[PDB]
Design an enzyme around this catalytic site. Structure first.
Site, PDB file in Angstrom:
ATOM      1  CG  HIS A   1      -1.888  -1.111   1.301  1.00 20.01           C
ATOM      2  ND1 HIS A   1      -3.144  -1.061   0.738  1.00 20.01           N
ATOM      3  CD2 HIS A   1      -1.778  -2.338   1.868  1.00 20.01           C
ATOM      4  CE1 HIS A   1      -3.769  -2.205   0.955  1.00 20.01           C
ATOM      5  NE2 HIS A   1      -2.960  -2.997   1.639  1.00 20.01           N
TER       6      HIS A   1
ATOM      7  CE  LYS B   1      -5.659  13.420   0.641  1.00 18.83           C
ATOM      8  NZ  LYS B   1      -6.731  12.909  -0.266  1.00 18.83           N
ATOM      9  NE  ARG B   2      -4.157  10.285  10.432  1.00 19.32           N
ATOM     10  CZ  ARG B   2      -3.779   9.293  11.235  1.00 19.32           C
ATOM     11  NH1 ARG B   2      -4.516   8.196  11.338  1.00 19.32           N
ATOM     12  NH2 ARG B   2      -2.669   9.410  11.956  1.00 19.32           N
TER      13      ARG B   2
ATOM     14  CE  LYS C   1      -2.765  10.828   3.280  1.00 14.99           C
ATOM     15  NZ  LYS C   1      -3.445  10.178   2.113  1.00 14.99           N
TER      16      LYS C   1
ATOM     17  CB  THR D   1     -10.041   4.904  -1.014  1.00 14.52           C
ATOM     18  OG1 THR D   1      -9.689   5.293   0.314  1.00 14.52           O
ATOM     19  CG2 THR D   1      -9.222   3.691  -1.432  1.00 14.52           C
TER      20      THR D   1
ATOM     21  CE  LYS E   1     -13.651   6.530   1.242  1.00 13.81           C
ATOM     22  NZ  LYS E   1     -13.133   6.861   2.555  1.00 13.81           N
TER      23      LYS E   1
HETATM   24  O1  LIG Z   1       0.115   2.371   4.705  1.00 15.22           O
HETATM   25  C1  LIG Z   1      -0.707   3.175   5.194  1.00 15.22           C
HETATM   26  O2  LIG Z   1      -0.555   3.615   6.357  1.00 15.22           O
HETATM   27  C2  LIG Z   1      -1.849   3.597   4.357  1.00 15.22           C
HETATM   28  O3  LIG Z   1      -2.877   4.088   4.871  1.00 15.22           O
HETATM   29  N1  LIG Z   1      -1.705   3.419   3.028  1.00 15.22           N
HETATM   30  C3  LIG Z   1      -2.778   3.814   2.176  1.00 15.22           C
HETATM   31  O4  LIG Z   1      -3.526   2.618   1.747  1.00 15.22           O
HETATM   32  C4  LIG Z   1      -4.652   2.963   0.882  1.00 15.22           C
HETATM   33  C5  LIG Z   1      -5.400   1.649   0.481  1.00 15.22           C
HETATM   34  O5  LIG Z   1      -4.640   0.858  -0.456  1.00 15.22           O
HETATM   35  C6  LIG Z   1      -4.131   3.747  -0.408  1.00 15.22           C
HETATM   36  O6  LIG Z   1      -5.240   4.098  -1.234  1.00 15.22           O
HETATM   37  C7  LIG Z   1      -3.375   5.014   0.020  1.00 15.22           C
HETATM   38  O7  LIG Z   1      -2.877   5.727  -1.159  1.00 15.22           O
HETATM   39  C8  LIG Z   1      -2.182   4.606   0.942  1.00 15.22           C
HETATM   40  O8  LIG Z   1      -1.448   5.786   1.398  1.00 15.22           O
HETATM   41  C1  LIG Z   2     -11.805   7.080   2.654  1.00 11.90           C
HETATM   42  C2  LIG Z   2     -11.162   7.572   3.974  1.00 11.90           C
HETATM   43  C3  LIG Z   2      -9.790   7.786   4.079  1.00 11.90           C
HETATM   44  C4  LIG Z   2      -8.816   7.677   2.890  1.00 11.90           C
HETATM   45  O1  LIG Z   2      -8.809   8.945   2.218  1.00 11.90           O
HETATM   46  P1  LIG Z   2      -7.670   9.300   1.126  1.00 11.90           P
HETATM   47  O2  LIG Z   2      -7.944  10.685   0.740  1.00 11.90           O
HETATM   48  O3  LIG Z   2      -7.599   8.238   0.110  1.00 11.90           O
HETATM   49  O4  LIG Z   2      -6.360   9.263   1.976  1.00 11.90           O
HETATM   50  C5  LIG Z   2      -9.275   8.231   5.245  1.00 11.90           C
HETATM   51  N1  LIG Z   2     -10.067   8.455   6.304  1.00 11.90           N
HETATM   52  C6  LIG Z   2     -11.401   8.249   6.249  1.00 11.90           C
HETATM   53  C7  LIG Z   2     -12.221   8.464   7.526  1.00 11.90           C
HETATM   54  C8  LIG Z   2     -11.973   7.810   5.086  1.00 11.90           C
HETATM   55  O5  LIG Z   2     -13.355   7.617   5.020  1.00 11.90           O
END
Ligand SMILES: O=C(O)C(=O)N[C@@H]1O[C@H](CO)[C@@H](O)[C@H](O)[C@H]1O
Ligand SMILES: *Cc1c(COP(=O)(O)O)cnc(C)c1O
Ligand SMILES: O=C(O)C(=O)N[C@@H]1O[C@H](CO)[C@@H](O)[C@H](O)[C@H]1O
Ligand SMILES: *Cc1c(COP(=O)(O)O)cnc(C)c1O
Lengths: 810, 810
Positions: free
Chosen positions: B351, B542-543, B548, B650, B654
């Site tokens: 990932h 997002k985090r 990012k 992801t 959404k």
């Molecule tokens: O490794 C992590 O801490 C993490 O959250 N990785 C996350 O996994 C998601 C699911 O495959 C990807 O869509 C994100 O791009 C990736 O940063």
């Molecule tokens: C979908 C989701 C994420 C992942 O968001 P990205 O923008 O792909 O990092 C993180 N946190 C929550 C609560 C989500 O619903």
């Protein structure tokens, strides 16, 4: 099957089965193909539980509407045991559930054995609280039991190599279907901090906060549709607690450890900080709950009219200064008014006179943990001593003797003195004990306020201790006098007119024989151990302690063994001596006593010459559930504490109610039991309290008995030489040294009379008919020892409320 | 009310009400007079839960009978969110429950807001696992999610003085109605100890034991009556544990801390012992469960035919050596046979490519904690390298690059290398990411075993991310093309024929406006904060992480503010810039970024000249439940990571599914999203991966951009001078220093193109009709991003099982 277990109606049995299947499916998420006996137990527990809720909700709604005076029983221990059968008995559902489970192809007795004991107590004190809750509900009192929901109760005892091993009592492992968490009523409890004196009043600030989450358990009265509540607090850390990040979250354990485990001491004070935290925790959370309930009924003058707080020993003694703190610091009442309210609200029950059991907390501990309370205690002491000085001018020694503050190495607070000063009633738990309190340890207080001192002889609930554990006996009794005695035990006196009834004599003896056979079977089932059901069942079950003198029993057992070895082909009444009980983990002598008992068994049980004439068995993990099994099977009850040490005793009452004769000293309730049944129907022996005092004034010298009693000398020499410990010859040196040089309980002094008395017991056992007739005389006069009688006295003489036997609409 | 929420039948609604009242009474022990909204929530949760059990039991019985290949998804994170609405949606009970609660005088939406989020995840990785479970159940796969039941999930974020404050997520406080404890399936897990080499085989002895207690949660498929299981393990100390007495009981906390809290890191590796224990704990307990289930179906040759284990990143990588340990040490299979089985059973999903996120455990840690596993890892490495040496003779550097063991300061085990060697399939999560893996970090492995490498582009479940959070949109879509798309998202392409439909255009725009009004209201309700519903909702949730680039967003916001201040009376499209997300507690820069955002808001939101033209709000405590609220209300989705850093993303999917246009870089899934919708319907900008590499080869010098871009220079000078932090002029020195001298993510490099692109976004927003038409083109082509499509690919191409849309009899 039998009458006192209610009706097994057509509709009710059908309803029970459906609901049983419903819970198995929806609640446990299982089907008959993968369900285990435990799953079935829970399905039944939830089904029975459902029948409680309706009554529980209306009972509480009832108290809200009528607003009667509330009784709050504060205790750090509630030794409840199992709840399933007790609930069925009180709701008259036993036969119905028995039938319903039968039709489902299940054995209910097998399912009942699956429930874990709620062992939130050590022994007598905690069990008393449990019996009391049952009686208060049965007598329709608006009573609440308040305590701590220990994650781990009294440890499970394992015997390894003859030694006691302790293991955590993870009683909540599979969940507790009886409790209802009430997180919505969570309250904050404060610790540490400091006191700030501002313009108007003092303030307790900079405190550490721990949340108290209540769990409610229903307490059903006997067939009166009353269901009271036992509320137990659980410690929870606030979420901003300690808020590296990970460590802060992990450290929440520090605050939650408060409700983690029950201190396993019986009649022994251990001044540890954690214990003090538990004591304040229960008191602080409970008082806020009490006041909240009072406010939802400003006028604290009426507080004593709507509230009664009973302190089960000094463990919850901080309720006195905590109540003062709330009234003075938070409600802003003047001191004198607050004190008036506090005294009229609180009552204290003492359960012991042993010095090592009295709570004397180091001032430095209270100083750091509860700074405001220490100040309040000093103020209470100041005012109390001013009263003493005015009543006994110039008596400076009385002042120092009565002070709540003890001077010396480290200053300590005598919690018992605090309780007497802040309570309108102080009671002992047996007539002799209450008299000892007035004549000795509390003499100064009695002279200052004689009106405060009372007696409330202990009792046991006839529901759990007769109907539940001995249905066979309850049945034959009901056959002759009806069922009314179950909630009016005094009616057992009517059995006196059957003492010469041949049919009754035969039934009483038959029930006992059946109980012995059942127990003898159980011993081989769960413990693989063969015994003779025809022998006299001589049992002593209670916590292991030097004052209870299991050692005196051991000396008798060895005496019997030596006599047999001396004259092998001489006839002697066969006996199965059973001794059981747990020892506090840090009580070395108690642990050595357990080892001695098993060591004696090792020799006696394998001696070919003895045969099945004498067996010595140590009953492992004695607990409430085991008591319900062995007591109904006993022939002889050993209540042999040194006169003046057992405040009351309650196991003694359980044995009397279940058809066992008693061999004992004139100590605690034994005195009243013998008085009720007639001394000629009791096996009394040994020194009376006065004899013990005479011996102390003169000086107890064990050597004297050793020199004048050959049989005793032989036993001591066997112990010393390693006769009972071949591989470890000096294994019992500590025991011999204690018996010979520092036996605070004069074991040797009662040895001769004890052995002699035991001979009379064996003589009577040889005459089945007369033994049983004496048993009937005991059962018939055990009525006074029902906790219903005890609670009725507390109600009228201390709490100022009338008990009621009125059914509530179900 | 609306069609996609099922029927509100007469009998069903009546039944729901009765069962609701039944639970309120018997389950919660309350009546309508004292019940609180929380009580009502639980009554409803239990009622809905009841409808799951029947299907849950037969689904499992079904798998037992048919014995299909089982899919085990191992993850240390399952970011589930709330369960009530999701369960109603999948069981077609939403309208019925809505009606039933309505008739009971309750607002169901109000009750749903009471449920605590099951936040057992950090972000994308954990949410992916949750979406996957939903899809696997919807596709009828015999799948099991295995993880850890953390007592505390991701921390709740509080903003104080503009700074992030963390507080424990005590999500189990009020209980969890969805889980079912299964203490009967408790398994032992071993730690520490040592390895003994005997005659036949090695033995792992003298270990410390921790029990793994499973809790099962049902996972319902969408209207197919399938209910799979997510089994989460909880750590329990054995009862003989550490067995002063009190301390031994208290120390049980040490062992139980394993499942206490989720490590709050997103894309960052923290080599702490506790984390390693959690990883082995989940793996050890899960594998025993898997093998147990396999045996109850000796022939491990068929193990790979009945079992598939998917490793969600390297967190559960110890499954490989643990499986080898069990097969070799316990089952006694020869190494080569065991290895064959292991490889065919395991598959690994990567990932991330960020170096700081890769797990590299110190050998000394594994040596002490898992001695046998280290030995197995060395043996695996030895044999793997022998294979490499044979394929590339003499290439000594390749050997050291591919080794599972990394040499240097401290030897470490590269868990990613371990996973590739022991898995038959390795996949990336987006086409570009999977290609990067083969071209860079895993190039050597790809050359050795090209067949192992695959791509499985991520997806999101259309149930939670459309039907549940945006019923209004799901409805207008269903009105035109039916409901079949909910489990066949590709059908959304049919909406393309409505791009010129005036009625549809109007409805799409109306739904968005309603969502914005609802969200704008929520912002004032729970957070008291006024915003303009007519403005463009520009959101980045997002985090918080440097890659990012929330910082790039900040630069744009400040640019907009400076432009307004320069020409106040010039018209500009009104915007509400919303940024939300949590920062790992120990990630300093991330915490500084949050402070910067709130600081910018402090200035911008109170500048009279700006008015309601620009607002900057930081969305506090971003979590799954909040995502369900803000995403449907968004107009513009910010997906601006530096090209090559976001594996997939992801959240981007959404937003696309919910009617927001996307401004982003050609990174992760953004590339495929733009490809699906057409680049002209996406706002792409910035460097492509190739441009980033070119810049790195040449050397990134931020000063260059600062010198050539006046507007950028102005922003940096404002930050440095204290314009956004008057009282603390140098508050953001770390941020400026990083941007200027060590910005690994080239924020400045994409600034110009980003601002330019943002201008085109504002231009299109000024034309409501064309903006909406572009939105329709996005929604219509978002079908590929359904996790049903993703799981179907995993099923066929990796697990070797066929998905099924067949209903099970309910
Ligand atoms: O490794 C992590 O801490 C993490 O959250 N990785 C996350 O996994 C998601 C699911 O495959 C990807 O869509 C994100 O791009 C990736 O940063
Ligand atoms: C979908 C989701 C994420 C992942 O968001 P990205 O923008 O792909 O990092 C993180 N946190 C929550 C609560 C989500 O619903
Ligand atoms: O103080 C103790 O630890 C304790 O168990 N005390 C016990 O309380 C019982 C109930 O009043 C009495 O019957 C016992 O005699 C007394 O030792
Ligand atoms: C009744 C009881 C006690 C008290 O017994 P005594 O002999 O009065 O000390 C202790 N433990 C258990 C389990 C009991 O049932």
């Amino acid at each position: 099957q039998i009458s006192v277990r209610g009706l097994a109606g057509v509709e009710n049995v059908t309803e029970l089965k459906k609901n049983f299947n419903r819970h198995l499916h929806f609640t446990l998420v299982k089907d008959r193909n993968v369900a285990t006996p435990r799953d079935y137990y829970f399905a039944l527990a939830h089904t029975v539980r459902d029948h409680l809720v309706g009554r529980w909700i209306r009972t509480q709604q009832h108290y809200y509407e009528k607003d009667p005076k509330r009784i709050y029983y504060l205790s750090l221990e509630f030794y409840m045991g199992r709840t399933l059968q007790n609930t069925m008995v009180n709701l008259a559902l036993e036969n119905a559930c028995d039938e319903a489970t039968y039709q489902l192809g299940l054995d209910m007795e097998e399912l009942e054995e699956i429930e874990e004991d709620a062992g939130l107590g050590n022994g007598g004190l905690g069990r008393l609280a449990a019996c009391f809750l049952d009686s208060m509900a049965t007598l329709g009192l608006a009573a609440y039991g308040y305590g701590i929901r220990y994650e781990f109760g009294i440890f499970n005892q394992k015997i390894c190599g003859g030694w006691q091993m302790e293991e955590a009592d993870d009683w909540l492992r599979y969940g507790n279907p009886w409790e209802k968490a009430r997180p919505e009523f969570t309250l904050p409890v404060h610790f540490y901090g400091r006191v700030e004196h501002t313009s108007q009043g003092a303030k307790w600030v900079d405190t550490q906060v721990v949340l108290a989450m209540p769990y409610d358990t229903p307490v059903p009265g006997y067939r009166n549709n009353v269901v009271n509540t036992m509320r137990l607090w659980s410690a929870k850390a606030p979420n901003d607690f300690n808020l590296g990040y990970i460590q802060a979250v992990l450290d929440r354990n520090l605050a939650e450890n408060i409700s983690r485990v029950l201190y396993p001491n019986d009649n022994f004070f251990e001044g540890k900080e954690l214990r003090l935290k538990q004591e304040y925790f229960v008191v602080a959370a409970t008082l806020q709950d009490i006041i909240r309930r009072f406010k939802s009924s400003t006028n604290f003058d009426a507080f004593p009219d709507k509230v009664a707080i009973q302190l089960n020993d000094t463990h919850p003694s901080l309720a006195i200064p905590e109540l003062m703190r709330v009234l003075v610091d938070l409600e802003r009442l003047d001191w004198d008014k607050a004190w008036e309210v506090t005294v009229k609200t609180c009552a204290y029950t003492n359960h012991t006179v042993l010095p090592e059991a009295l709570e004397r907390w180091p001032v430095h501990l209270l100083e750091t943990l509860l700074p405001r309370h220490l100040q309040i205690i000093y103020e209470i002491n100041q005012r109390f001593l001013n009263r003493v000085a005015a009543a006994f001018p110039g008596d400076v020694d009385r002042l120092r003797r009565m002070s709540l503050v003890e001077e010396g190495a480290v200053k300590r607070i005598n919690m018992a003195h605090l309780c007497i000063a802040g309570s309108h009633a102080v009671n002992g738990v047996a007539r002799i004990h209450s008299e000892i309190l007035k004549k000795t340890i509390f003499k100064d207080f009695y002279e200052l306020e004689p009106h405060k001192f009372q007696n409330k002889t202990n009792g046991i609930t006839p529901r759990r201790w007769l109907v539940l554990c001995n249905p066979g006996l309850a049945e034959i009794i009901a056959e002759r006098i009806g069922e009314e005695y179950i909630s009016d035990l005094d009616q057992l006196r009517k059995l006196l007119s059957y003492v010469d009834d041949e049919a009754f004599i035969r039934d009483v003896a038959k029930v006992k024989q059946e109980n012995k056979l059942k127990f003898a079977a159980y011993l081989e089932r769960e413990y693989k151990v063969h015994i003779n059901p025809n022998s006299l069942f001589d049992v002593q079950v209670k916590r292991i302690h030097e004052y209870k003198r299991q050692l005196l029993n051991c000396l008798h057992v060895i005496t019997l063994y030596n006599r047999i070895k001396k004259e092998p082909n001489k006839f002697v009444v066969p006996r199965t001596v059973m001794i059981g009980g747990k020892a506090a983990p840090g009580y070395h002598m108690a642990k050595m006593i357990i080892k001695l008992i098993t060591a004696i068994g090792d020799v006696v049980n394998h001696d070919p010459v003895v045969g099945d004439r004498l067996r010595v068995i140590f009953l492992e993990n004695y607990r409430v559930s085991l008591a319900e099994k062995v007591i109904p099977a006993a022939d002889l009850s050993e209540q042999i504490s040194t006169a003046g040490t057992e405040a009351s005793g309650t196991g003694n009452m359980k044995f009397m109610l279940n058809g066992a004769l008693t061999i004992g000293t004139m100590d605690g309730a034994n005195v009243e039991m013998a008085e009720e049944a007639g001394e000629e129907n009791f096996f009394i022996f040994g020194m009376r309290v006065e004899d013990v005092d005479r011996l102390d004034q003169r000086g107890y010298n064990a050597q004297e008995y050793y020199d004048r009693i050959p049989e005793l000398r032989q036993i001591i020499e066997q112990l010393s030489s390693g006769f009972f410990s071949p591989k470890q010859p000096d294994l019992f040196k500590d025991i011999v040294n204690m018996l010979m040089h520092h036996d605070r309980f004069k074991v040797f002094a009662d040895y001769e009379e004890y052995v002699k008395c035991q001979e009379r017991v064996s003589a009577l056992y040889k005459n089945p008919r007369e033994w049983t007739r004496m048993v009937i005389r005991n059962i018939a006069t055990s009525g006074k020892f029902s906790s219903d009688r005890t609670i009725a006295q507390y109600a009228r003489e201390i709490w100022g409320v009338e008990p009621s036997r009125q059914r509530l609409p179900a």
